[PDB]
Scaffold this active site. Structure first.
Site, PDB file in Angstrom:
ATOM      1  CE  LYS A 147     -15.467  28.447 -46.367  1.00  0.00           C
ATOM      2  NZ  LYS A 147     -16.226  29.121 -45.361  1.00  0.00           N
TER       3      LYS A 147
ATOM      4  CG  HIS B 145     -18.663  32.618 -45.764  1.00  0.00           C
ATOM      5  ND1 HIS B 145     -18.568  33.301 -46.673  1.00  0.00           N
ATOM      6  CD2 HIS B 145     -17.808  32.288 -45.102  1.00  0.00           C
ATOM      7  CE1 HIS B 145     -17.511  33.152 -46.735  1.00  0.00           C
ATOM      8  NE2 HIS B 145     -17.080  32.565 -46.135  1.00  0.00           N
TER       9      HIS B 145
ATOM     10  NE  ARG C 265     -15.892  27.599 -51.505  1.00  0.00           N
ATOM     11  CZ  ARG C 265     -16.225  28.283 -52.273  1.00  0.00           C
ATOM     12  NH1 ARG C 265     -16.647  27.967 -53.547  1.00  0.00           N
ATOM     13  NH2 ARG C 265     -15.735  29.510 -51.905  1.00  0.00           N
TER      14      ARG C 265
ATOM     15  CG  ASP D  73     -14.546  30.438 -43.083  1.00  0.00           C
ATOM     16  OD1 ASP D  73     -15.403  31.229 -43.884  1.00  0.00           O
ATOM     17  OD2 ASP D  73     -14.789  29.563 -43.628  1.00  0.00           O
TER      18      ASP D  73
ATOM     19  CB  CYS E 211     -15.492  42.572 -49.098  1.00  0.00           C
ATOM     20  SG  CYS E 211     -16.422  42.418 -51.078  1.00  0.00           S
TER      21      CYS E 211
ATOM     22  CB  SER F 228     -14.069  36.563 -52.830  1.00  0.00           C
ATOM     23  OG  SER F 228     -14.880  36.079 -52.978  1.00  0.00           O
TER      24      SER F 228
ATOM     25  CE1 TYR G 122      -7.347  24.934 -51.569  1.00  0.00           C
ATOM     26  CE2 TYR G 122      -5.088  24.017 -52.139  1.00  0.00           C
ATOM     27  CZ  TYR G 122      -5.671  24.628 -50.933  1.00  0.00           C
ATOM     28  OH  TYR G 122      -4.877  26.051 -51.611  1.00  0.00           O
TER      29      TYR G 122
ATOM     30  NE  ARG H  38      -7.490  29.304 -49.262  1.00  0.00           N
ATOM     31  CZ  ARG H  38      -8.768  28.957 -49.100  1.00  0.00           C
ATOM     32  NH1 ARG H  38      -8.681  29.790 -47.503  1.00  0.00           N
ATOM     33  NH2 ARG H  38      -9.273  29.153 -49.690  1.00  0.00           N
TER      34      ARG H  38
HETATM   35  N1  LIG Z   1      -8.639  50.348 -48.344  1.00  0.00           N
HETATM   36  C1  LIG Z   1      -8.852  49.148 -47.587  1.00  0.00           C
HETATM   37  N2  LIG Z   1      -8.519  47.929 -48.579  1.00  0.00           N
HETATM   38  C2  LIG Z   1      -8.213  46.859 -47.387  1.00  0.00           C
HETATM   39  C3  LIG Z   1      -9.040  46.945 -46.147  1.00  0.00           C
HETATM   40  N3  LIG Z   1      -9.116  46.039 -45.536  1.00  0.00           N
HETATM   41  C4  LIG Z   1      -8.985  44.803 -46.391  1.00  0.00           C
HETATM   42  N4  LIG Z   1      -8.437  45.677 -47.882  1.00  0.00           N
HETATM   43  C5  LIG Z   1      -7.223  44.823 -48.505  1.00  0.00           C
HETATM   44  O1  LIG Z   1      -9.026  44.303 -49.775  1.00  0.00           O
HETATM   45  C6  LIG Z   1      -7.969  43.178 -49.735  1.00  0.00           C
HETATM   46  C7  LIG Z   1      -8.828  42.145 -49.657  1.00  0.00           C
HETATM   47  O2  LIG Z   1      -8.823  42.118 -48.189  1.00  0.00           O
HETATM   48  P1  LIG Z   1      -9.073  40.811 -47.309  1.00  0.00           P
HETATM   49  O3  LIG Z   1      -9.398  40.976 -45.335  1.00  0.00           O
HETATM   50  O4  LIG Z   1      -8.244  40.013 -47.486  1.00  0.00           O
HETATM   51  O5  LIG Z   1     -10.786  40.404 -47.355  1.00  0.00           O
HETATM   52  P2  LIG Z   1     -11.262  38.812 -47.237  1.00  0.00           P
HETATM   53  O6  LIG Z   1     -11.291  38.100 -48.785  1.00  0.00           O
HETATM   54  O7  LIG Z   1     -12.944  38.969 -47.068  1.00  0.00           O
HETATM   55  O8  LIG Z   1     -10.785  37.812 -46.353  1.00  0.00           O
HETATM   56  C8  LIG Z   1      -6.718  42.912 -49.437  1.00  0.00           C
HETATM   57  O9  LIG Z   1      -5.997  43.127 -50.543  1.00  0.00           O
HETATM   58  C9  LIG Z   1      -6.446  43.572 -48.543  1.00  0.00           C
HETATM   59  O10 LIG Z   1      -5.602  43.894 -48.094  1.00  0.00           O
HETATM   60  C10 LIG Z   1      -9.823  48.092 -45.353  1.00  0.00           C
HETATM   61  O11 LIG Z   1     -10.588  48.668 -44.264  1.00  0.00           O
HETATM   62  N5  LIG Z   1      -8.882  49.383 -46.755  1.00  0.00           N
HETATM   63 MN   LIG Z   2     -15.390  31.448 -46.222  1.00  0.00          MN
HETATM   64 MN   LIG Z   3     -11.487  34.411 -43.385  1.00  0.00          MN
END
Ligand SMILES: Nc1nc2c(ncn2[C@@H]2O[C@H](COP(=O)(O)OP(=O)(O)O)[C@@H](O)[C@H]2O)c(=O)[nH]1
Ligand SMILES: [Mn+2]
Ligand SMILES: [Mn+2]
Ligand SMILES: [Mn+2]
Ligand SMILES: [Mn+2]
Ligand code: NA
Length: 611
Positions: A243, A263, A86, A310, A287, A285, A234, A404
C-alpha cells in the site's frame, strides 16, 4: 572512505552478501541506517529458495511461526492481538504544505488522508529509530514492483528487522539479487521498517510477535522518495511495497509523470468467439472485489483470468492504449469468507507455499476460518487464532476478521497468461462498485469520461461511508488534484479512454434478501459490458447512465429474476443521493473540486429533476 577510528564501515557485521557489491546509493542507504538503528548483523537478501527455507525453519524453531502439516510448505503466524491490521490513524504523509496532501475540509478532520508536518515527523522519527534494531538482524530486501525490468516497474529497497516481513516480501514482490542487478545506479524508493523492539526487550513479548503499538507510525515522504514505518509487524504497515509504495508513493509519482496507480483488480475476459478484453475494477471493502478477479464464470464459453486482484499501474502507450500491470507478485487476501464452495480458484491458489496469519488451525494441521463452508470430518477439532480451543458454538470467531493468506500469484489456476508481460495489458473498461442495499441498479454505464470520473468520485464502500475510487485510505496527495489528474486524461491526444461502468452486486429486496445471485453469475454482467465496449446497441438511456435493455442480459438458468426492481430507478432515491453527494464533495473537497465534477453534479441533479 576516510575514518579516524572505525565507526563508519559496517562490513564486519555483514552475514550475507557484500556491502562492496551494492550500488553506491544503496550502500549509503544501508550503512546510514545501520549507523542509526544499530543492528547486530546485516543480511543482504538474495531471494533464493535456500535463503527462504532456512529463515522459515529459523522462525519455526523460535516459535515465531508454525508449520501446517496438512499442506505442502504452508506456515502459520499468530500475532499479538494489538497488531492485527494496517492502522489508518497512525498512517501519515509528509509534505511542505498540508493542502498538497489533503484538501482542507470545511469542518472537522479530512476523511481523505492524514498529513504530518516535516517538523513533527523529525521529532517522531528521533523518538523511535535511534538504536531500534539493537541485537537484531537488519535484512536488506531489494525488490521490484512489477515484472523485473518492465518499463512500468519501479524498484525499492526495504530494510527491516523482521524475518516475517522478509518471507512475505519474497511472495508479494520480486526480490533478491537479480533486482539489484537490474537496478544498477538507478533511482529506487527508500523503505525503512522496524518492529521497534530493540534487545534486550523493554516490554513483554506477546505471542512471539515483536511490535510497539504505542509508537506505531507509518510515514510517507513523497518528495524524498522515502517510506518510513515503525512499530507494526503487520501487512499494510510492514510490507512496504503493497500500500505504502504501490498506492501512496506511486500515486504521487503517477501524478508527476502522467500515469495512474490505482486500487484495482485487473482481469482478462474471453467470450465464446475467443475474443479477449481486459478490464480493471476498483471496489471498496465488502463490495465484492475478491469474488471477481478469480470468478468461475457460469455462462458457457466464457473465460475469466486474473492479472491481479488489488493494485493496478496504468499508463497510456504510444498508440493510446491504457496499459496496465499488476505491480505485485502475490496475493495478500483476507481469509475469512474465502469459501471452498464459492471461490474455488482462491482455495486452489493457497494449497501450497502459503503463509497464513491469524487464521484457525485444525487438528490435522489444516486451516480454518468463518465462511470457509467446508465441514470437518467428525473428531477433527479447531484451535483459534488466539491459540485456544474453539467450538462452532463459541462467542468469538475462530480466525481474526482481518486474518490473511499470503500466496504466490503464479499459483492461481486462472492467473492470466499476460500477468507478467512487461508492456502491460490493454484496458478497455474500468468498473467501480460498492455495497448498496438500495436504489442503485445492478449495472450502469457512464455517459462520458467526465461523468465516469464523477461516478468514481461518488462511490460508497457500504450503506453510508464514502470511498471515492476505493482510494480513501490510499491517496498519495490532494484528492481534488487526483480528480483533476483523472479528468486530464481526456485531453491526451489519441487516448483510447476506457468505458466506465458502476456495478452493485448487493442490492437487497424488501426483506434484506439479495436481488442478484452474484458470484459466477456476474459473468452475465461482464458479457453485457464486453458487448457495450464492442459498440452493441444493448443499452437504454436513464438519468444515471446507460443500463441494459429489456432482454439484453442473459438470464437463462436463473429462473425468475426481478429485472424491474433490480434495475429500478426512483426519483426520490436519486434526489437524496445527489444532495448527499453534493454535501460530501462540498465538505471534503470544496475549493479543490474540479469544475467538471461540479458540472457533472449539476447535470445529474438536472436529469433527476426532469423525472
Ligand atoms: N449477494 C452477493 N454477495 C456477494 C457477491 N460477491 C461477494 N459477496 C459477499 O459480500 C461480502 C464481500 O465480498 P468480497 O468479494 O470478499 O468483497 P471485498 O471485500 O471487496 O473483497 C462477502 O460476504 C461476499 O460473500 C455477489 O455477487 N452477490
Ligand atoms: Mn486492497
Ligand atoms: Mn482483494
Ligand atoms: Mn483480497
Ligand atoms: Mn476537460
Ligand atoms: Na506468534
Amino acid at each position: 572512505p576516510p575514518q579516524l577510528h572505525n565507526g563508519l564501515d559496517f562490513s564486519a557485521k555483514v552475514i550475507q552478501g557484500s556491502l562492496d557489491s551494492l550500488p553506491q546509493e544503496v550502500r549509503k542507504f544501508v550503512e546510514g541506517n545501520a549507523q542509526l538503528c544499530q543492528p547486530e548483523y546485516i543480511h543482504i537478501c538474495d531471494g533464493s529458495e535456500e535463503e527462504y527455507g532456512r529463515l522459515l525453519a529459523h522462525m519455526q524453531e523460535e516459535g515465531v511461526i508454525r508449520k501446517l502439516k496438512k499442506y505442502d510448505n504452508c506456515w502459520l503466524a499468530l500475532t499479538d492481538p494489538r497488531d492485527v491490521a494496517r492502522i489508518e490513524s497512525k498512517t501519515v504523509i509528509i509534505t511542505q504544505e498540508q493542502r498538497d496532501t489533503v484538501p482542507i475540509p470545511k469542518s472537522g478532520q479530512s476523511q481523505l488522508g492524514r498529513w504530518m508536518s516535516e517538523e513533527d515527523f523529525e521529532k517522531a522519527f528521533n523518538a523511535r529509530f535511534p538504536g531500534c534494531m539493537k541485537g537484531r538482524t537488519m535484512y536488506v530486501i531489494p525488490f521490484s514492483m512489477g515484472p523485473l525490468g518492465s518499463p512500468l516497474a519501479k524498484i525499492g529497497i526495504e530494510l527491516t528487522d523482521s524475518p516475517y516481513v522478509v518471507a512475505s516480501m519474497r511472495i508479494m514482490t520480486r526480490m533478491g539479487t537479480s533486482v539489484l542487478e537490474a537496478l544498477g545506479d538507478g533511482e529506487f524508493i527508500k523503505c525503512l521498517h522496524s518492529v521497534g523492539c530493540p534487545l534486550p526487550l523493554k516490554k513483554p513479548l506477546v505471542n512471539n510477535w515483536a511490535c510497539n503499538p504505542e509508537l506505531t507510525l507509518i510515514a510517507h515522504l513523497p518528495d524524498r522518495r522515502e517510506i518510513i514505518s515503525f512499530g507494526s509487524g503487520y501487512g499494510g504497515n510492514s510490507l512496504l511495497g503493497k500500500k505504502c509504495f504501490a498506492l501512496r508513493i506511486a500515486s504521487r509519482l503517477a501524478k508527476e509523470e502522467g500515469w495512474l496507480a490505482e486500487h484495482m483488480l485487473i482481469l482478462g475476459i474471453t467470450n465464446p468467439e475467443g475474443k479477449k478484453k481486459y478490464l480493471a475494477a476498483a471496489f471498496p471493502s465488502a463490495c465484492g472485489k475478491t469474488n471477481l478477479a478469480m470468478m468461475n464464470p457460469t455462462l458457457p464459453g466464457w473465460k475469466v483470468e486474473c492479472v491481479g486482484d488489488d493494485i493496478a499501474w496504468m499508463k497510456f502507450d504510444a498508440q493510446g492504449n491504457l496499459r496496465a500491470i499488476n505491480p505485485e507478485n502475490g496475493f495478500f487476501g483476507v481469509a475469512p469468507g474465502t469459501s471452498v464452495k464459492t471461490n474455488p480458484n482462491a482455495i486452489k491458489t493457497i494449497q501450497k507455499n502459503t503463509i497464513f496469519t491469524n487464521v484457525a488451525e485444525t487438528s490435522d494441521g489444516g486451516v480454518y476460518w468463518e465462511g470457509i463452508d467446508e465441514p470437518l470430518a467428525p473428531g477433527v477439532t479447531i484451535t483459534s487464532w488466539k491459540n485456544k480451543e474453539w467450538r462452532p458454538q463459541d462467542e468469538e470467531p475462530c480466525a481474526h476478521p482481518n486474518s490473511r493468506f499470503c500466496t504466490p500469484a503464479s499459483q492461481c489456476p486462472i492467473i492470466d497468461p499476460a500477468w507478467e508481460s512487461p508492456e502491460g495489458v490493454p484496458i478497455e473498461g474500468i468498473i467501480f462498485g460498492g455495497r448498496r442495499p438500495a436504489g442503485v441498479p445492478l449495472v450502469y454505464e457512464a455517459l462520458s469520461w467526465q461523468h465516469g470520473v464523477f461516478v468514481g468520485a461518488a462511490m460508497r464502500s457500504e450503506g453510508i461511508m464514502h470511498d471515492p475510487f476505493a482510494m480513501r485510505p490510499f491517496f498519495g496527495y490532494n484528492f481534488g488534484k487526483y480528480l483533476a489528474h483523472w479528468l486530464s486524461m481526456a485531453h491526451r491526444p489519441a487516448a483510447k479512454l476506457p468505458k466506465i461502468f458502476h456495478v452493485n452486486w448487493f442490492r437487497k429486496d424488501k426483506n434484506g434478501k439479495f436481488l442478484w445471485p452474484g458470484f459466477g453469475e456476474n459473468s452475465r454482467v461482464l458479457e453485457w459490458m464486453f458487448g457495450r465496449i464492442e459498440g452493441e446497441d444493448s443499452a437504454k438511456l436513464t438519468p444515471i447512465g446507460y443500463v441494459p435493455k429489456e432482454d439484453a442480459l442473459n438470464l437463462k438458468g436463473l429462473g425468475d429474476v426481478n429485472v424491474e426492481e433490480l434495475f429500478g430507478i426512483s426519483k426520490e432515491f436519486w434526489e437524496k443521493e445527489v444532495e448527499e453527494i453534493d454535501k460530501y464533495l462540498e465538505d471534503q473537497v470544496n475549493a479543490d473540486l474540479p469544475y467538471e465534477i461540479e458540472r457533472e453534479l449539476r447535470a445529474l441533479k438536472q436529469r433527476i429533476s426532469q423525472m
